[PDB]
Amino acid sequence: AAKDVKFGNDARVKMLRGVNVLADAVKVTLGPKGRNVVLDKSFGAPTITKDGVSVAREIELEDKFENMGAQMVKEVASKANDAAGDGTTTATVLAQAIITEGLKAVAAGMNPMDLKRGIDKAVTAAVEELKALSVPCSDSKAIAQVGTISANSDETVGKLIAEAMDKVGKEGVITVEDGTGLQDELDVVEGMQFDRGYLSPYFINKPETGAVELESPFILLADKKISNIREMLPVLEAVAKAGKPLLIIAEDVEGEALATLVVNTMRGIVKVAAVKAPGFGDRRKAMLQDIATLTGGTVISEEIGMELEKATLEDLGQAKRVVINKDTTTIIDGVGEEAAIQGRVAQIRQQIEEATSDYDREKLQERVAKLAGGVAVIKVGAATEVEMKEKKARVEDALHATRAAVEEGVVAGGGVALIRVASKLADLRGQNEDQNVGIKVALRAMEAPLRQIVLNCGEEPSVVANTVKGGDGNYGYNAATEEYGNMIDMGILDPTKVTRSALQYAASVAGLMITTECMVTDLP
Amino acid sequence: AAKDVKFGNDARVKMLRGVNVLADAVKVTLGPKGRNVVLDKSFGAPTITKDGVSVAREIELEDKFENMGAQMVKEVASKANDAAGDGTTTATVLAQAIITEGLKAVAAGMNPMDLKRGIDKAVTAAVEELKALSVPCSDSKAIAQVGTISANSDETVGKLIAEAMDKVGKEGVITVEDGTGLQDELDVVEGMQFDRGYLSPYFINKPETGAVELESPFILLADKKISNIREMLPVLEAVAKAGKPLLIIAEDVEGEALATLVVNTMRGIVKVAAVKAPGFGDRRKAMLQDIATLTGGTVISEEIGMELEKATLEDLGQAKRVVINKDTTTIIDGVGEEAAIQGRVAQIRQQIEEATSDYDREKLQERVAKLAGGVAVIKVGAATEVEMKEKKARVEDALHATRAAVEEGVVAGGGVALIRVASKLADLRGQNEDQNVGIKVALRAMEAPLRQIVLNCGEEPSVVANTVKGGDGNYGYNAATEEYGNMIDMGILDPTKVTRSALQYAASVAGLMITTECMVTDLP
Amino acid sequence: AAKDVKFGNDARVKMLRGVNVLADAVKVTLGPKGRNVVLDKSFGAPTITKDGVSVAREIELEDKFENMGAQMVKEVASKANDAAGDGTTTATVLAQAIITEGLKAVAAGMNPMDLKRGIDKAVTAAVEELKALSVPCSDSKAIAQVGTISANSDETVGKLIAEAMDKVGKEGVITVEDGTGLQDELDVVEGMQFDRGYLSPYFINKPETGAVELESPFILLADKKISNIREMLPVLEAVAKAGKPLLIIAEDVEGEALATLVVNTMRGIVKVAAVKAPGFGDRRKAMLQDIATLTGGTVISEEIGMELEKATLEDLGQAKRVVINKDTTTIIDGVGEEAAIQGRVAQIRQQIEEATSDYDREKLQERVAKLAGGVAVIKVGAATEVEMKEKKARVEDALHATRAAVEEGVVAGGGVALIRVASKLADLRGQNEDQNVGIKVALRAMEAPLRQIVLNCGEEPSVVANTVKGGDGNYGYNAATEEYGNMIDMGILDPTKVTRSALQYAASVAGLMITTECMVTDLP
Amino acid sequence: AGGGVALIRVASKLADLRGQNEDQNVGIKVALRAMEAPLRQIVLNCGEEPSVVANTVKGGDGNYGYNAATEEYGNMIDMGILDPTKVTRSALQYAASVAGLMITTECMVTDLP
């Protein structure tokens, strides 16, 4: 189809206008005094929300060039939230601030490539400065405090997470489920988590989490690329007859097969999700068998001669639950034999002895850590159902935050860390004046999040910004009760990971846009 | 009159557009390979010219805001030509270059006041560097060869000027008029020149030179302001039947009287011109008398109860010729008796001895210098009349250039002095980064005149300018013969005065425009 | 007045379009089979003409930029006719051909200045080649047959001119007027001609030859510039009641005086015409006394204390007739006594052997040649008044053609001389390729006039041009009978002067246009 | 040598190459100017004056080291900036192929909009 091609400055203002709509819509939700955004539904009452992520999902623009702008920052900003459980809105307002100033510099005739290198240098320096500014979360007392803070000062939630992490370690897998009564439950069950997500976003049945969630699923273990649906028919009919969902783990599910699965689960008929097997090559064949022994399934491998048309129910594995992310699949409470698993553990442990290198050794150690490790399950209790469901969400929110704090620590929240780190770098220079301007564009943009909060709070951003630039370490502006004196100790914090990720992703996309000279799209 | 008001960016894009039309029209004439501009005369054939001054004069624009732009730089550029005899076109292209870049910086968000200060500092430094680069014109051998160069290698013009300066000093008054035969003539006659021009254009009867030129006029010397024409008629009636022009020297000529004289002279009824008396206060009264002695006239003064209605042809002075600039009146060959002038020269010389103030003594010394010095008259000859009129214009031209050369010396022509002077100021800084941009805006602008010239030649400006920068002192690019060498030796030079004036004036108007936030004009 | 400004390509397409209308209107009249052009009057019948000059005069265009184009070449082309008595149309079609090709080259990216230099070199070479091709007109037999040819093979006109030139020399002044009967008359009378014409086109009383013609005038000879009518009044009131016209020869007649004279002669009062005196300075004073003697009047000279208010009829000179051109004044049958003129000739001849200077000798010898040469007066007779005027016009037109033929000789007519000369420069190069293209543009253009003639005759321009190029010298295409032989022998010739002038002027304006980058005119 | 310096270096070698008529000569010069385009663009993308660098490369010999990464001088191939001769040859030949066909195109037929 014939295209619409836009160049240089013309292309760049179109993008800017696009991100401006996305950012202006999203940034009003930022901070404790954030405003409501009303998102229309095709029927019934509109949704009123203060969630920047929900707002971003809906943003799509008529002008195809403007829309490209929006969808670009939208995708990298969402990556911040994927990695850290937070930061999408922050990433978005940072991106806008860099792009706005960056493009002004380009229009002045400064080199876009030098501007990007300056921005990048400033960001690299800033990330290091975040690391030094960071306070660790070692003991379970600190872990509890972070969980508590991330759940509106609910000490029950902090306690729950701390007790869960105590059972499975820092590295361990932790799951949240609906409760069965008034009081909470904590159990460690046979389970595993690997780094592969849904092969189509249309498998999602939990839009709020953006996740697939299947209860009592059957599990298909195929050592091949399933491309045509005709292999699957004997299985798919049997899964439908039994009435349970189906998770497919294989080398890949593509084209004809994936399309048929997507529309069918979308159309109600059988509940199916599909993910790639974890890893590649030989380690991939092994990991399938780990999951097979974990779930009481048989790996259908066309290498032994097994045909997928010939697989029956008994060949399928089983679990109590399965949760799938954009890039995580986790299996909860495997019906796999409580003795076949230790046989598999023994095997791998034995392979560790006869391994001939550091790599081969530690890669086998990953598998036992998964297999013998298991999965912690928190069952959230409450008085009524709505209180139970609401607390589950707060427990899932705090779990993300706490896991993020565990690995990188915490820094002063409400944006005061970004502006704090920015002031540390007032002396940073590049190779030429263009790069220098690039550095300054970043250190200004880093003030965006805070200045916004202060604007939403009906206060003068500049006056606050100054006072914040006057303090040290984690002294800053209490964005809620309007005070000053060590943010972290008074419960206003972000995991360092979320602030770092927000900044890095914003700079990533802002850099790409500043260095964009051409745009190709379809005709209106 | 209801007004049209424009602000900020809107105002200054209009202004820039206006100077763009002016500069683009004018810059094409620059250098040896300058292009033609065709100027329409509503009667007969159009004028084809390479004269940037003639082109500039015609430029007036329909959009009243754009027009303001053009008129602003037109005014300031013309002052360069007034001061130095050349440089209007150069000032214009410099102004365009500074404004274009300056506004780019303003639109980027840099402080216009700091940009101006940066430009000013760069110019002050450049003017200083220009004096260091300058080669003096001390002796009359150098005077001769600068005159020769300014008249297209005509050595006759060179030694005419040299001999004239030899007669009356380097600061003497040298005037030039039509010859009477084949041979040139040089005579020193009783005369004077003072710093007061025509009280109005429209007295201009030499549109080519922009001057008033009166043959054998009478001179009225009035020690008062002339407001109404009522007291003027008896003198006008007396001068009308005498059949000769009249120069009026008064404290001022205003409204009613001036308007009638403007109208009456432009109808052809009587050929009149009016100029303010030189200086002010008590010094004015004496200088009026000085002229009166020189010209053999009587000063009519209110002080001693003298009425203008009673002043006859007797009281009127006489001279062979008078010439009037925008800021200069020159009375040539005054009739006054030798005894009376020498007698008065003796009077002032006595007063110099008696003077009890260094300032008072200096002002007196100045008066004798004019009165005793007289005026050099160059009568220019040729074989035919058209050659005689041509050579005269080449003498006039070279005479202007020679005065400027004697005052401030000569520098490399073809705009290489400006680029050299810039190239030595690379490491010059200001208070902040905006001033630094201001400096770089000036130092890039100084390249414009050369680059333009090189463009008109159909060559790569960037290559030629680059090579010039890599040279020293008065090394450069001979645009006519495309050769690199010593500019002064090869005879491609500007008087330092014209280069300095062009730069200072360009920067003056450019700075004012950059710092403009509002414009007020009439409705279309 | 707000202006309309156009640049580069935009400017020059407008300019080209303007010359296209002019040239296309004019070129159709060229050669023996030239077409008619109809020119509309305000009233009565339109004028039908084959005269390219009459057509050119009427051409004026609505688009002010296009009009500039037309007026530019109109001006330059008319100078050819002024110089040679012919060639305006030719100059115009040459100009079109050079411009069309020149701009094509500019639009291709070739340097306009180098193109101009190439054209100029090709023309200089062509003019040189034209002199080599030229056949002289030495004796009066050749003079007769050139006159015969210029008057449509009328041998009477031929030997009239031959006899006139025999009487007054080849450089004598020959004038032609209405006859008094059937027979022609030839008389040498006291007269003069100088290179000054009418000071105002409105003095013209004979629109036919754009000439001022005065029967039995008084001649006022004033050694001064006349600005006011004041001093004229006694002389004018005296000349009015005498009932005779007045010729004023002053240093100059300006402003109020010129305006008054024009308005008065144009309607009602008195019939006057004023011209500048010839030369300048001392020679101007001298030549006035020459005219004074010839016409038997007195010079009224300011210097000796003479006033015009005191002048009388005796001071005025007298002559039978005076004719005044754009460029020439001729005084016929001076009343001044023979004894007076003899003695002035002896005066000047004494100074010839008193002054030792090759220049002063020629200047004095030129004065006696004028004074003692007189003027030949051809009175043209015929059977009918209509025939007389018709024959008179053929004499006037033939006289010009013979004067040019004496000076520079004759070359092949019908546009062969140019093709012949152009084919001899096939090897002429410049300093670069842009110059070489310029050279070819001129050589191709020199084919335009012939090619047009051939087109008018309905033959093929390419074939005919081809055959001429194969021939030598003055062999070529007989533009009427359609054969190939000696062009001069067959009587198809141009004076070399008209071909040379046509080419030089065409190239002059074409070069200027090619090198035009900007145009300024008033708003529509 | 890469960075577009091969094409420029090869075009400087052919200054004196002439054809059969003046038109073929313009055809020659069109190609020799065109061979500068790649480097000229590379330099434009880096924010340096395409004409200065072009001029500098022209006064060099063989594969003379203009650093397309850091901008400095040694030996182009030896400092790792190169193209296989095949790619530079193929690029030039195919470009000339189609450019030639387009220059000599007088008519175009397509469907109605």
PDB file of N, CA and C in Angstrom, chain A residues 3-15 64-65 68-69 72 103 106 112 512-521, chain D residues 41 45:
ATOM      1  N   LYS A   3       2.450   4.777   0.786  1.00  0.00           N
ATOM      2  CA  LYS A   3       2.857   5.267   2.096  1.00  0.00           C
ATOM      3  C   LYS A   3       2.888   6.791   2.180  1.00  0.00           C
ATOM      4  N   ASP A   4       2.846   7.291   3.410  1.00  0.00           N
ATOM      5  CA  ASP A   4       3.056   8.697   3.706  1.00  0.00           C
ATOM      6  C   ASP A   4       4.417   8.824   4.391  1.00  0.00           C
ATOM      7  N   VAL A   5       5.339   9.537   3.751  1.00  0.00           N
ATOM      8  CA  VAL A   5       6.705   9.672   4.252  1.00  0.00           C
ATOM      9  C   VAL A   5       6.981  11.102   4.713  1.00  0.00           C
ATOM     10  N   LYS A   6       7.383  11.255   5.971  1.00  0.00           N
ATOM     11  CA  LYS A   6       7.731  12.571   6.517  1.00  0.00           C
ATOM     12  C   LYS A   6       9.178  12.653   6.978  1.00  0.00           C
ATOM     13  N   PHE A   7       9.779  13.827   6.797  1.00  0.00           N
ATOM     14  CA  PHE A   7      11.216  14.003   6.988  1.00  0.00           C
ATOM     15  C   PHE A   7      11.579  15.023   8.054  1.00  0.00           C
ATOM     16  N   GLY A   8      12.806  14.903   8.552  1.00  0.00           N
ATOM     17  CA  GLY A   8      13.412  15.853   9.476  1.00  0.00           C
ATOM     18  C   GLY A   8      12.501  16.516  10.487  1.00  0.00           C
ATOM     19  N   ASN A   9      12.466  17.843  10.437  1.00  0.00           N
ATOM     20  CA  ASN A   9      11.737  18.639  11.408  1.00  0.00           C
ATOM     21  C   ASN A   9      10.231  18.408  11.374  1.00  0.00           C
ATOM     22  N   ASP A  10       9.696  18.249  10.167  1.00  0.00           N
ATOM     23  CA  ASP A  10       8.282  17.954   9.958  1.00  0.00           C
ATOM     24  C   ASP A  10       7.877  16.654  10.657  1.00  0.00           C
ATOM     25  N   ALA A  11       8.700  15.618  10.496  1.00  0.00           N
ATOM     26  CA  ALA A  11       8.480  14.329  11.147  1.00  0.00           C
ATOM     27  C   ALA A  11       8.593  14.447  12.655  1.00  0.00           C
ATOM     28  N   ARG A  12       9.542  15.258  13.113  1.00  0.00           N
ATOM     29  CA  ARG A  12       9.832  15.357  14.541  1.00  0.00           C
ATOM     30  C   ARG A  12       8.775  16.102  15.368  1.00  0.00           C
ATOM     31  N   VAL A  13       8.157  17.150  14.820  1.00  0.00           N
ATOM     32  CA  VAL A  13       7.070  17.827  15.560  1.00  0.00           C
ATOM     33  C   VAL A  13       5.832  16.932  15.679  1.00  0.00           C
ATOM     34  N   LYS A  14       5.573  16.132  14.646  1.00  0.00           N
ATOM     35  CA  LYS A  14       4.463  15.181  14.652  1.00  0.00           C
ATOM     36  C   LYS A  14       4.619  14.189  15.795  1.00  0.00           C
ATOM     37  N   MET A  15       5.812  13.619  15.923  1.00  0.00           N
ATOM     38  CA  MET A  15       6.108  12.729  17.036  1.00  0.00           C
ATOM     39  C   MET A  15       5.926  13.421  18.375  1.00  0.00           C
ATOM     40  N   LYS A  64      -1.514   9.483  12.032  1.00  0.00           N
ATOM     41  CA  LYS A  64      -0.666   8.293  12.077  1.00  0.00           C
ATOM     42  C   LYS A  64       0.765   8.577  12.525  1.00  0.00           C
ATOM     43  N   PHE A  65       1.258   9.774  12.222  1.00  0.00           N
ATOM     44  CA  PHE A  65       2.592  10.178  12.657  1.00  0.00           C
ATOM     45  C   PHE A  65       2.600  10.516  14.142  1.00  0.00           C
ATOM     46  N   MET A  68       2.371   7.274  16.051  1.00  0.00           N
ATOM     47  CA  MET A  68       3.675   6.616  16.131  1.00  0.00           C
ATOM     48  C   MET A  68       4.467   7.138  17.327  1.00  0.00           C
ATOM     49  N   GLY A  69       4.521   8.464  17.457  1.00  0.00           N
ATOM     50  CA  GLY A  69       5.144   9.125  18.600  1.00  0.00           C
ATOM     51  C   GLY A  69       4.668   8.549  19.918  1.00  0.00           C
ATOM     52  N   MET A  72       5.482   4.730  20.569  1.00  0.00           N
ATOM     53  CA  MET A  72       6.907   4.520  20.797  1.00  0.00           C
ATOM     54  C   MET A  72       7.285   4.660  22.265  1.00  0.00           C
ATOM     55  N   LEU A 103      14.597  18.285  21.086  1.00  0.00           N
ATOM     56  CA  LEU A 103      14.157  18.764  19.775  1.00  0.00           C
ATOM     57  C   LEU A 103      14.377  20.257  19.607  1.00  0.00           C
ATOM     58  N   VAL A 106      17.850  20.477  18.622  1.00  0.00           N
ATOM     59  CA  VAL A 106      18.012  20.053  17.230  1.00  0.00           C
ATOM     60  C   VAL A 106      17.621  21.179  16.276  1.00  0.00           C
ATOM     61  N   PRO A 112      22.141  15.984  16.484  1.00  0.00           N
ATOM     62  CA  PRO A 112      21.282  15.052  17.217  1.00  0.00           C
ATOM     63  C   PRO A 112      22.046  13.867  17.804  1.00  0.00           C
ATOM     64  N   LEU A 512      16.289   7.837  20.738  1.00  0.00           N
ATOM     65  CA  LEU A 512      15.915   7.322  19.419  1.00  0.00           C
ATOM     66  C   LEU A 512      15.088   8.336  18.639  1.00  0.00           C
ATOM     67  N   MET A 513      14.218   9.060  19.337  1.00  0.00           N
ATOM     68  CA  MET A 513      13.363  10.049  18.694  1.00  0.00           C
ATOM     69  C   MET A 513      14.134  11.290  18.275  1.00  0.00           C
ATOM     70  N   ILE A 514      15.052  11.737  19.126  1.00  0.00           N
ATOM     71  CA  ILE A 514      15.903  12.890  18.822  1.00  0.00           C
ATOM     72  C   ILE A 514      16.763  12.623  17.582  1.00  0.00           C
ATOM     73  N   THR A 515      17.117  11.357  17.380  1.00  0.00           N
ATOM     74  CA  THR A 515      17.961  10.966  16.259  1.00  0.00           C
ATOM     75  C   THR A 515      17.162  10.354  15.113  1.00  0.00           C
ATOM     76  N   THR A 516      15.871  10.677  15.044  1.00  0.00           N
ATOM     77  CA  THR A 516      15.002  10.204  13.964  1.00  0.00           C
ATOM     78  C   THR A 516      14.905  11.259  12.870  1.00  0.00           C
ATOM     79  N   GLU A 517      15.191  10.852  11.635  1.00  0.00           N
ATOM     80  CA  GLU A 517      15.114  11.752  10.484  1.00  0.00           C
ATOM     81  C   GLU A 517      13.970  11.450   9.515  1.00  0.00           C
ATOM     82  N   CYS A 518      13.397  10.256   9.596  1.00  0.00           N
ATOM     83  CA  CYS A 518      12.367   9.863   8.647  1.00  0.00           C
ATOM     84  C   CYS A 518      11.298   8.965   9.258  1.00  0.00           C
ATOM     85  N   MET A 519      10.063   9.122   8.786  1.00  0.00           N
ATOM     86  CA  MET A 519       8.930   8.330   9.259  1.00  0.00           C
ATOM     87  C   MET A 519       8.075   7.853   8.097  1.00  0.00           C
ATOM     88  N   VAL A 520       7.809   6.551   8.066  1.00  0.00           N
ATOM     89  CA  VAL A 520       6.984   5.947   7.024  1.00  0.00           C
ATOM     90  C   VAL A 520       5.750   5.313   7.660  1.00  0.00           C
ATOM     91  N   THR A 521       4.575   5.675   7.155  1.00  0.00           N
ATOM     92  CA  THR A 521       3.311   5.106   7.621  1.00  0.00           C
ATOM     93  C   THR A 521       2.318   4.959   6.469  1.00  0.00           C
TER      94      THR A 521
ATOM     95  N   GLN D  41      27.382  12.409   1.803  1.00  0.00           N
ATOM     96  CA  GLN D  41      26.254  12.136   2.691  1.00  0.00           C
ATOM     97  C   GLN D  41      26.719  11.660   4.067  1.00  0.00           C
ATOM     98  N   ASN D  45      25.796  13.402   7.576  1.00  0.00           N
ATOM     99  CA  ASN D  45      25.190  12.722   8.723  1.00  0.00           C
ATOM    100  C   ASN D  45      25.941  12.930  10.042  1.00  0.00           C
TER     101      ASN D  45
END
